[PDB]
Amino acid sequence: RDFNNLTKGLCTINSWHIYGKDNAVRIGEDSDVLVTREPYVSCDPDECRFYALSQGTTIRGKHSNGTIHDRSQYRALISWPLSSPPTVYNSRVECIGWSSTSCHDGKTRMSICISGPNNNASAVIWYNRRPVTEINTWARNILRTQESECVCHNGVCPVVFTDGSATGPAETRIYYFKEGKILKWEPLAGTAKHIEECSCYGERAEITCTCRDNWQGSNRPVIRIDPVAMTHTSQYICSPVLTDNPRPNDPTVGKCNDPYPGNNNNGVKGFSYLDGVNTWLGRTISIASRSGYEMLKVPNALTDDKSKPTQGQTIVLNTDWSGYSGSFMDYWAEGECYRACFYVELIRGRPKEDKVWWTSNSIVSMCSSTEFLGQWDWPDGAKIEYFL
Amino acid sequence: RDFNNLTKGLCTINSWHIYGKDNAVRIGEDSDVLVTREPYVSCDPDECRFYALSQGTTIRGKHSNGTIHDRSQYRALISWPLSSPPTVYNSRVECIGWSSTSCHDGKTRMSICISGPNNNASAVIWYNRRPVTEINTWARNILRTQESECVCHNGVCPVVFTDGSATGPAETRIYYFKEGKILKWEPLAGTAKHIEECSCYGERAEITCTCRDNWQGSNRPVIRIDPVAMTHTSQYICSPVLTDNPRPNDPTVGKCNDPYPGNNNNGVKGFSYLDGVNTWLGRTISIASRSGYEMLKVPNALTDDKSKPTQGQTIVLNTDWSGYSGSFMDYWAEGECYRACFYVELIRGRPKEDKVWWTSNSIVSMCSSTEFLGQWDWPDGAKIEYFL
Amino acid sequence: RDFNNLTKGLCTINSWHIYGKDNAVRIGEDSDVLVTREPYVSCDPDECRFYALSQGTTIRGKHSNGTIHDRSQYRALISWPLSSPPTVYNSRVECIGWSSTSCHDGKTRMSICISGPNNNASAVIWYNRRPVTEINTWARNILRTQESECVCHNGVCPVVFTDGSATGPAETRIYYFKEGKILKWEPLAGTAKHIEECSCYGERAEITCTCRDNWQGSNRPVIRIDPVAMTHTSQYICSPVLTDNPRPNDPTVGKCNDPYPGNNNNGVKGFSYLDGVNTWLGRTISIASRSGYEMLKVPNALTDDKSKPTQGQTIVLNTDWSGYSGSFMDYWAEGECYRACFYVELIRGRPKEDKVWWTSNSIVSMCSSTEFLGQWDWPDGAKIEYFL
Amino acid sequence: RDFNNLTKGLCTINSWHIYGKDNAVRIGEDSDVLVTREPYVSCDPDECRFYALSQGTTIRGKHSNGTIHDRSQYRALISWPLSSPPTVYNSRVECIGWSSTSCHDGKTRMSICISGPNNNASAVIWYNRRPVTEINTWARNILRTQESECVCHNGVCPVVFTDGSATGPAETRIYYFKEGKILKWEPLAGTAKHIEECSCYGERAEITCTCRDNWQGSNRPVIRIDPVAMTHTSQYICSPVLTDNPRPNDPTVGKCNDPYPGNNNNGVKGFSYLDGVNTWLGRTISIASRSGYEMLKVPNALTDDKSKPTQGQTIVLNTDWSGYSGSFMDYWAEGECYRACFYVELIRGRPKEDKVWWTSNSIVSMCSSTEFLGQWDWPDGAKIEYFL
Ligand SMILES: *[C@@H]1O[C@H](CO)[C@@H](O[C@@H]2O[C@H](CO)[C@@H](O[C@@H]3O[C@H](CO[C@H]4O[C@H](CO[C@H]5O[C@H](CO)[C@@H](O)[C@H](O)[C@@H]5O)[C@@H](O)[C@H](O[C@H]5O[C@H](CO)[C@@H](O)[C@H](O)[C@@H]5O)[C@@H]4O)[C@@H](O)[C@H](O[C@H]4O[C@H](CO)[C@@H](O)[C@H](O)[C@@H]4O[C@H]4O[C@H](CO)[C@@H](O)[C@H](O)[C@@H]4O[C@H]4O[C@H](CO)[C@@H](O)[C@H](O)[C@@H]4O)[C@@H]3O)[C@H](O)[C@H]2NC(C)=O)[C@H](O)[C@H]1NC(C)=O
Ligand SMILES: *[C@@H]1O[C@H](CO)[C@@H](O[C@@H]2O[C@H](CO)[C@@H](O[C@@H]3O[C@H](CO[C@H]4O[C@H](CO[C@H]5O[C@H](CO)[C@@H](O)[C@H](O)[C@@H]5O)[C@@H](O)[C@H](O[C@H]5O[C@H](CO)[C@@H](O)[C@H](O)[C@@H]5O)[C@@H]4O)[C@@H](O)[C@H](O[C@H]4O[C@H](CO)[C@@H](O)[C@H](O)[C@@H]4O[C@H]4O[C@H](CO)[C@@H](O)[C@H](O)[C@@H]4O[C@H]4O[C@H](CO)[C@@H](O)[C@H](O)[C@@H]4O)[C@@H]3O)[C@H](O)[C@H]2NC(C)=O)[C@H](O)[C@H]1NC(C)=O
Ligand SMILES: *[C@@H]1O[C@H](CO)[C@@H](O[C@@H]2O[C@H](CO)[C@@H](O[C@@H]3O[C@H](CO[C@H]4O[C@H](CO[C@H]5O[C@H](CO)[C@@H](O)[C@H](O)[C@@H]5O)[C@@H](O)[C@H](O[C@H]5O[C@H](CO)[C@@H](O)[C@H](O)[C@@H]5O)[C@@H]4O)[C@@H](O)[C@H](O[C@H]4O[C@H](CO)[C@@H](O)[C@H](O)[C@@H]4O[C@H]4O[C@H](CO)[C@@H](O)[C@H](O)[C@@H]4O[C@H]4O[C@H](CO)[C@@H](O)[C@H](O)[C@@H]4O)[C@@H]3O)[C@H](O)[C@H]2NC(C)=O)[C@H](O)[C@H]1NC(C)=O
Ligand SMILES: *[C@@H]1O[C@H](CO)[C@@H](O[C@@H]2O[C@H](CO)[C@@H](O[C@@H]3O[C@H](CO[C@H]4O[C@H](CO[C@H]5O[C@H](CO)[C@@H](O)[C@H](O)[C@@H]5O)[C@@H](O)[C@H](O[C@H]5O[C@H](CO)[C@@H](O)[C@H](O)[C@@H]5O)[C@@H]4O)[C@@H](O)[C@H](O[C@H]4O[C@H](CO)[C@@H](O)[C@H](O)[C@@H]4O[C@H]4O[C@H](CO)[C@@H](O)[C@H](O)[C@@H]4O[C@H]4O[C@H](CO)[C@@H](O)[C@H](O)[C@@H]4O)[C@@H]3O)[C@H](O)[C@H]2NC(C)=O)[C@H](O)[C@H]1NC(C)=O
Ligand SMILES: CC(=O)N[C@H]1[C@H]([C@H](O)[C@H](O)CO)OC(C(=O)O)=C(F)[C@@H]1NC(=N)N
Ligand SMILES: CC(=O)N[C@H]1[C@H]([C@H](O)[C@H](O)CO)OC(C(=O)O)=C(F)[C@@H]1NC(=N)N
Ligand SMILES: CC(=O)N[C@H]1[C@H]([C@H](O)[C@H](O)CO)OC(C(=O)O)=C(F)[C@@H]1NC(=N)N
Ligand SMILES: [Ca+2]
Ligand SMILES: [Ca+2]
Ligand SMILES: [Ca+2]
Ligand SMILES: [Ca+2]
């Protein structure tokens, strides 16, 4: 086993095909399914798995009451087989905490969980299923990380962390890990003014992350990382196709180097694939809430402040709930190019559906096709009324 | 690991012995068993497994209400250990969709799931548990495939798909796959006038499929495929022993090159083994409904339009429900010949048993014996009244 | 991997230590535990497992009603990890039927299940988890076999079957299998007048089985088998310490070559270790019912028609239910001798406890010690009243 | 695989990071979680697992009634994946009994369970998942052992047992095992006057155990073992920071060679790391009950009868229940030093919470960091009222 290297480009994305779906809320209506949120997908060389933050109770369990809260001592990063639900009996605990990331470097897996109180959180970096490095909070304000997979190149796996205000300037750092040890870290550079929850992918020896400016931006910040030099910059997606949520209506011209204004102090984790004409952006269909989800092909979105969609695909109808969304690729598939993939978290329960006392989610995930495939929509599918 | 080659003939079939049975509806009365239908069996070189289409809910779960429907976003091909039930906790998802096939080529497994709306369905072809090829609907009318295992020879695994009307001419294609990639495809040839749900087996470098003419035929169409030349023809089973359902009474003479008339627009998936005097046909015992199941030895059924049974074996009594039935063989068993096997789906719930709001099934499977074994009957065994 | 050979003698048995216990009825009061009976234990070279006949329903399930019956289409030989309970989710199906045996030959496992109606039963012999040989009923009267493990020597695994009356002369055969194929079979020889449910062990190239004379004997028949010559004889245990159940009071003198009279048409599966002075017999404590269980050291029991106990060990109190009991050894342990082991089935429910509608069991198993260990008793431990 | 050797020293302990937490009582409110107590953690070369004594019933099960009792026939040492709960379906039985220890020697695992009545208990020593050696009670008074992992060095794995009074002099022995066989045993030596439940760790070819003087001491006895010479001594922790429970208030001066008085006939299993200035002691926060848990850095605690804390870390608040606590290390981690770890048992139910009829626990475990990490508290998290 050698470290994996990012030697391929992205396949041409002409549509999205179904990859995985776990139906966890439907099935967990009458089986021992854990309450989760903040899910993602990540591949090893011989298997791809679903990941999420457990809340340490099943959904039918009485302890599901109160699970709208983000951060407790009962949370852990869990993983489980692709498209199965996260059950008590099949879920494997990666580490303990309420913010995470995880990636395989070709030889073994690194998993990072942050736990603690808001003013005293710490990250523990696990490598080959043992704890190796720990990092203490630097700004004493909810140390937090990507909530989707990291990416490695020749052993170097950069990770984006943020510590500080959600509604003001914060202190974002890029840590470059290798075998779980810190090679280097840098403070955020470039023009992004606030960073959270970066969604990353790797192609041709470069790692691109699409993040959430929680403070001011409804355009998404982008961090581009060179994992060999161990350097980065940041900017925003130029495109007037705005992809955060909540957000104002789309203008005609976006902003490349500043937050696009109109909504403050709020947002959602999301992603994009930024590859010249082969660029696809994800977003909720609603400008106001986490409902619906679409993919739009927006040629040169990253660099063209007037780019608009040339194609699209509905993933979730606007009459169905969505949530966080994020990128991953199977870096160990055969063939000449990396096939872009993503998941969407389908959040159920509170706050939008408050007749139940819980919040949970299921997962749908697609990967790209070079065909122009017909679309379906992929909702969570559970009837909240069955839980009453 | 080399690609497997079909180098043996069928063993002499003198009776059928019990192979597997999961009792899923009985057990799922009080355990976390998934609602399924469209089951089958398929072997790898070191294990044989049960397969089916999940409905993405357990049977006791409230979401089992409505599961008579064939096609939703909550379905997936799952597999699980032989004769265990498909539970939440032991079932492995192969791919997402509501029509499937799957086979191992000696090196690894190919699995194909079709999903989408009726006018916009697509097939995703997985190989070694990754998506490799996608195929879009060509007639915009419920693209669909075998619902039982495919067969490979030297890496080439043909698969029969149909897109178009269930009650009229449709567009059937034979795709020849290798490592998940399309080597070739051909439109249906020969005299079969409508094809659905082919049940296939392989012997001496030839693949024989027994299919369902949904439009006109109560005799079954047969497709014979040369996986080296990558060519095929089709005809019908000549025999007056008619094997679709519903069907008219058996005549005295069948038809070789046309549908045998008497029932329109309906049928059920079934199979046969067509091997000269060693020929056995499966069918429901009832001409009117999916009840009962028998095997009949009908020497030269394929080519003799007056052949009648010379032996038989009851599998399921006419007072018990049956359903789809299909062929598979363990191509990696030791010994001089391939032992024919089959399963019967035992459908419970709607529409015949409408005091419950669900539809599900369990599975019974037999393989052939060179002995003349005593027969038992093998019903589903659940009491519907326990579910009330 | 070579075939295992029986090259060691029995270790000196000076007491019995606890080996395994699954508590299945206790735990299955509130978890998805299958209804079983006819359990046993058998080792592979790298693992020892519990085996039993499932009834194809959980114990809390409504289908547990009626499970006092011995033979249905819903039964299967299952195995599961040592001292775990047989659950829906962890139990592996070996084959389908309502009478079984199973043993590992050093290279792989042979499992035999008999199914069918009383007048038309057949055995299917599985080897390396595939069906290899089938055998049809020869006397049309409930073809049946050991219900505990077989034993192999250099690939040859003899198995004792009986077909015919339970209350009269029957036709017992010894089949000698190798890789699942029949090398030879012989009709029962020697002085045993009726044989059922043989409990076997192997030492120094000879296999000894202790069986149940259901028709006349309260002393147990014994079959001694030479697996190299493929020959056998039979006699009874001479000892006046009578070990079947129900049974008369112990006399002073037993019988070597005839059934010891006093009880007709009834009995229970049991076992012994017959090794000169190192001989230990198992039996229920009650002469009238399956309650209690003890081991007695009865020097030369096999050949001495006046032998009485020189030591003993209570396994289950007379105020607790027992059931079938049987022998196995770990033939792949390190060391100079084979350590004798046994299990006792602890039957709960009907017919003795008829406030519940089911019958099931749990398992306790001990192996011998060369120390003189203190004894405990090992009851099932469940409160029937919790199930009301 | 070679036997592991204790060739490293302890890493510098500057704080404790979260390692694992199973939330078993929360999750077991509505899933099939076994009732346990006396948990611990132990690593193999490729995996670390949770261990505990099952009570042979789930917590929601009616048989959980009465589980405050320590010793029944329904108990077994079980292990399960790190931070998962001990469920029916994922728990592996190591051996049967109501007192245990377990450790891996680099080649395979040794597990020891004691069972029997109080006056007739015996230990069975399993090695490579087979029983190898048995030891009978020597003082006929509840033969008992560590309840946390043992430690091996070059194949030699010493184990501390005690047989005799809990409230008076007893007979403690140190057995030195290798491949499950007794190399040697010695009676307790040095100044410790009563020993129970030793918590052990190994560094630089020496094994240190921190035990419980149940009879007189609120300071903890310490046994230091040379596994090459196979010799030991014992003394007490000198420090006036007293670490048993219940206990008097901390004095100013402790005792090195006698029990520190003030509480008789009671105590709790606990541990320490004794490494010069790098010494950390665990204890309950309450002097009166098993509530709260803290770690205190007490330089030279072992040898300095006036040492007081120079740092600390809260693990569990005084308003939350704790229980037994114990040491383990991952001896197969990479790097230059062994990272100290520990777990705390979080006992729920009786006797403190007597509105429920059961007693169970969950587990939290930490390992040391060379950083000064922020602290959180880690309670069990279940609401007893949900169980009413
Ligand atoms: C079976 O399956 C297939 C495969 O999925 C289905 O076919 C798919 O059908 C879908 C849905 O109909 C299509 O998605 C839409 O794509 C269009 C883009 O394609 C159109 O526009 C292209 C570019 O045109 C522009 O470029 C230049 C400019 O100089 C010039 O050429 C041109 O005139 C124009 O200015 C055209 O090239 C393209 O045409 C080609 O393809 C056609 C096939 O569809 C064919 O018929 C043609 O002949 C031709 O060859 C086509 O015209 C997306 O724009 C659209 O996305 C917008 O609309 C949806 C609402 O439906 C919305 O949710 C999106 O957010 C977006 O609209 C919002 O954002 C815009 C950007 O800011 C903004 O302008 C809009 O006002 C709107 O904003 C409002 O809503 C948002 C979101 O709520 C909010 O944030 C804002 O603030 C504001 O409120 C869809 O993605 C697929 O591309 C198509 N796929 C394929 C391969 O064909 C098929 O239908 C199914 N079949 C059946 C039988 O069911
Ligand atoms: C223990 O277990 C064993 C092993 O399982 C049990 O023994 C088995 O018993 C079963 C059931 O009894 C047998 O199955 C039946 O097999 C017969 C075929 O065998 C008979 O016919 C043979 C051929 O004869 C013809 O050939 C030539 C013609 O030129 C000529 O020789 C001859 O005169 C005749 O014209 C005979 O060779 C054969 O005889 C031999 O074997 C005998 C043993 O059974 C022995 O006794 C003899 O001495 C001799 O050596 C024997 O006569 C099947 O035909 C039958 O299948 C038909 O009947 C069942 C109803 O029972 C039906 O469900 C089937 O569908 C089928 O009948 C329908 O279809 C026909 C074809 O179209 C049609 O003609 C019928 O009118 C009927 O149609 C109606 O119903 C269908 C279905 O609903 C509907 O679609 C139509 O529209 C219409 O409504 C059974 O399969 C096993 O073969 C036998 N196995 C063995 C190895 O013996 C044993 O009983 C058990 N023991 C105990 C103690 O329980
Ligand atoms: C801690 O744990 C230890 C280890 O487990 C416990 O110690 C164990 O204690 C048990 C129970 O007490 C012992 O089991 C019993 O063993 C005796 C056999 O040992 C006795 O007899 C030996 C042989 O004597 C004969 O041989 C010759 C003859 O020429 C001659 O020497 C002699 O005089 C006599 O004729 C003696 O050698 C032996 O003595 C030695 O060991 C002693 C230790 O116990 C020691 O004290 C001595 O000093 C000496 O060194 C000893 O006397 C078994 O016979 C007995 O089994 C019978 O009894 C039980 C009822 O308790 C019954 O259930 C059995 O079925 C059996 O009795 C039935 O069957 C007989 C045979 O047919 C029949 O004769 C009886 O009438 C009776 O029949 C009735 O009931 C049956 C069954 O229901 C029914 O079918 C019939 O029809 C009829 O109704 C027990 O197995 C262990 O051996 C002992 N183990 C050890 C290593 O010591 C210890 O107690 C525990 N400690 C604490 C503190 O709890
Ligand atoms: C974010 O996270 C961080 C990291 O966790 C949090 O910071 C941690 O904060 C905790 C809690 O505040 C600290 O734990 C306490 O540690 C102190 C020991 O450190 C103090 O004392 C040191 C030694 O001083 C002595 O040494 C010499 C003597 O010659 C001399 O130098 C000196 O004057 C004195 O005599 C000092 O070196 C040390 O100072 C340094 O560090 C400071 C940081 O905290 C810094 O501010 C300073 O400037 C300096 O550089 C510091 O003063 C522990 O002693 C304490 O443990 C005692 O107290 C707790 C109650 O809180 C109690 O539960 C413990 O049991 C113990 O007290 C009992 O036992 C004593 C020993 O017998 C006895 O003396 C006491 O009376 C008491 O006894 C009673 O209760 C017990 C238990 O119930 C009972 O059994 C008895 O019978 C009796 O009833 C805590 O462990 C961490 O060390 C600190 N960690 C770090 C790295 O800083 C931070 O707060 C969090 N931040 C936020 C924003 O939340
Ligand atoms: C560390 C944290 O609480 N992040 C929030 C995160 C943060 O609150 C925001 O990113 C602002 O800092 O927001 C959301 C959300 O649904 O919007 C979550 F799902 C996240 N929950 C989580 N356990 N990781
Ligand atoms: C694609 C489809 O719906 N096929 C139907 C199929 C089709 O409706 C028919 O083959 C006609 O096209 O019919 C039946 C049936 O029970 O008869 C099913 F079980 C099938 N269900 C399924 N999910 N594959
Ligand atoms: C052998 C025994 O009962 N030990 C007690 C042990 C002993 O009673 C004491 O160590 C005194 O001998 O005390 C406690 C406890 O919670 O305090 C337990 F958890 C232990 N329970 C257990 N099954 N190992
Ligand atoms: Ca924002
Ligand atoms: Ca038809
Ligand atoms: Ca008898
Ligand atoms: Ca004490």
The CATH number given to whatever domain includes residue C180 is: 2.120.10.10
**D-contacting residues in A 182-241 (Cβ below 8 Å):** none
Task: Tell me the Ramachandran region of residue D215: left when phi exceeds 0, alpha when psi lies from -120 to 50, beta otherwise.
Answer: alpha
To the nearest 10°, report the CA torsion of C75, C77, C80, C85. 40
- Given a contact cutoff of 8 angstroms between Cβ atoms, the answer to whether D70 and D48 are in contact is no
> What are the chain A neighbours of D85 within 8 Å (beta carbons)?
88
Is B14 close to ligand 2, i.e. is its CB under 6 Å away? Answer: no
CA of D210 to the centre of ligand 11 (A): 12
Best mutation site among B35, B51, B55, B70 for ligand 6, i.e. most ligand atoms within 8 A of its Cβ? B70
> What are the chain C neighbours of B19 within 8 Å (beta carbons)?
96, 131
Give phi and psi for A54, each to the nearest 5.
-65, 155
C30–D62 C-beta distance less than 8 A: yes
D134–C381 C-beta distance less than 8 A: no
Is B262 close to ligand 2, i.e. is its CB under 6 Å away? Answer: no
DSSP annotation of A189 reads: -
CA distance C276 to C297: 10
To the nearest 10°, report the CA torsion of A133, A136, A139, A140. 140
Rounded to whole angstroms, the maximal C-alpha distance in chain D is 55
- Given a contact cutoff of 8 angstroms between Cβ atoms, the answer to whether A297 and A310 are in contact is yes
Q: How many Cα atoms within 13 Å fall on the side-chain side of residue D131?
A: 28
Rounded to a whole number, what is the distance in Å from the CA of B246 to chain C's nearest CA? 27
Measured in whole angstroms, how far is the alpha carbon of residue B25 from the centre of its chain? 20
List of residues 6+ apart from B354 with CB closer than 8 A? none
CA of D203 to the centre of ligand 1 (A): 67
CA triple A50-A52-A54, angle to 5 deg: 130
Residue A354 neighbours by CB distance under 10 Å: 11
Domain span at residue D49? 1-388
D20–A74 C-beta distance less than 8 A: no
D212 is in an annotated binding site: yes
Task: Sort B276 into a burial class: Cβ within 10 Å, 0-12 / 13-18 / 19+.
Answer: exposed
DSSP annotation of B220 reads: P
CA distance C346 to C50: 14
CA distance B294 to B344: 10
B217 is in an annotated binding site: yes
D371–A58 C-beta distance less than 8 A: no
**Burial per residue of B60-76, b for 16 or more beta-carbon CB atoms within 10 angstroms, e otherwise:** bbbbbebbeeebebbbb
List of residues 6+ apart from B62 with CB closer than 8 A? A29, A30, A383, A386
Q: Is the peptide bond before A246 cis (omega within 30 degrees of 0)?
A: yes
Task: Tell whether A61 is within 8 A of chain D (Cβ).
Answer: yes
Q: Which stretches of D121-216 are DSSP H helices? A: none
CA of D348 to the centre of ligand 7 (A): 16
CA distance B238 to B225: 18
CA distance A157 to A104: 9
- Given a contact cutoff of 8 angstroms between Cβ atoms, the answer to whether B86 and B54 are in contact is yes
D44 is in an annotated binding site: no
**A-contacting residues in D 73-102 (Cβ below 8 Å):** 81-85, 87, 89-90
Residues in chain D: 388
List of residues 6+ apart from D306 with CB closer than 8 A? D239, D240, D252, D253, D254
Domain total of chain A: 1
Q: Which of C258, C249, C186 is nearest to C222 (CA)?
A: C258
List the B130-136 sheet strands across, edge first: B99-104, B109-115, B122-127, B130-136
- Residues of A forming the annotated binding site for Ca(2+)? 213, 217, 244, 266
DSSP string, C354-386: TTSS-EEEEEEEEEEESS-PPP--------GGG
Q: Is the peptide bond before D351 cis (omega within 30 degrees of 0)?
A: yes
Q: Which two tokens stand for residue A103?
A: 């990636």
Is B312 close to ligand 2, i.e. is its CB under 6 Å away? Answer: yes
CA distance C325 to C41: 10
Q: Which stretches of chain B are DSSP H helices? A: 24-28
CA distance B180 to B127: 5
- Let me know if D163 is a catalytic residue: no
> What are the chain D neighbours of C31 within 8 Å (beta carbons)?
32, 58, 61, 88-89
Residue C111 pairs in a beta bridge with: C102, C126
Q: How far is CA D315 from CA A73, D18, D384, in A?
A: 12, 10, 21
Task: Tell whether C20 is within 8 A of chain D (Cβ).
Answer: yes
Is A375 close to ligand 1, i.e. is its CB under 6 Å away? Answer: yes
Q: How far is CA A143 from CA A97, A113, A118, A121, A195, in A?
A: 11, 10, 8, 6, 12
- Given a contact cutoff of 8 angstroms between Cβ atoms, the answer to whether B186 and B232 are in contact is yes
Residue A187 neighbours by CB distance under 10 Å: 9
Q: Which two tokens stand for residue D34?
A: 């076994």
Q: Which two tokens stand for residue D282?
A: 């665990």
Residue A355 neighbours by CB distance under 10 Å: 10
CA distance B72 to B147: 16
* Nearest ligand, measured from the Cα of D294: 4
- Let me know if A70 is a catalytic residue: yes
Q: Is the peptide bond before B158 cis (omega within 30 degrees of 0)?
A: no
D92 is in an annotated binding site: no
Given resolution (angstroms): 2.0
- Given a contact cutoff of 8 angstroms between Cβ atoms, the answer to whether C100 and C115 are in contact is no
Best mutation site among A115, A118, A119, A120 for ligand 4, i.e. most ligand atoms within 8 A of its Cβ? A120
CA distance D82 to D41: 8
Q: Which of D226, D225, D227, D217 is nearest to D195 (CA)?
A: D217
Q: Which two tokens stand for residue C184?
A: 């030879």
Rounded to a whole number, what is the distance in Å from the CA of D224 to chain A's nearest CA? 28
Q: Which of D35, D30, D33, D29 is nearest to D53 (CA)?
A: D35
CA distance C242 to C210: 13
The 3-state DSSP class for residue B125 equals strand
C382–D63 C-beta distance less than 8 A: yes
CA of D14 to the centre of ligand 4 (A): 14
Is A213 close to ligand 5, i.e. is its CB under 6 Å away? Answer: no
Q: Which of C244, C227, C237 is nearest to C274 (CA)?
A: C237
> What are the chain D neighbours of A137 within 8 Å (beta carbons)?
374
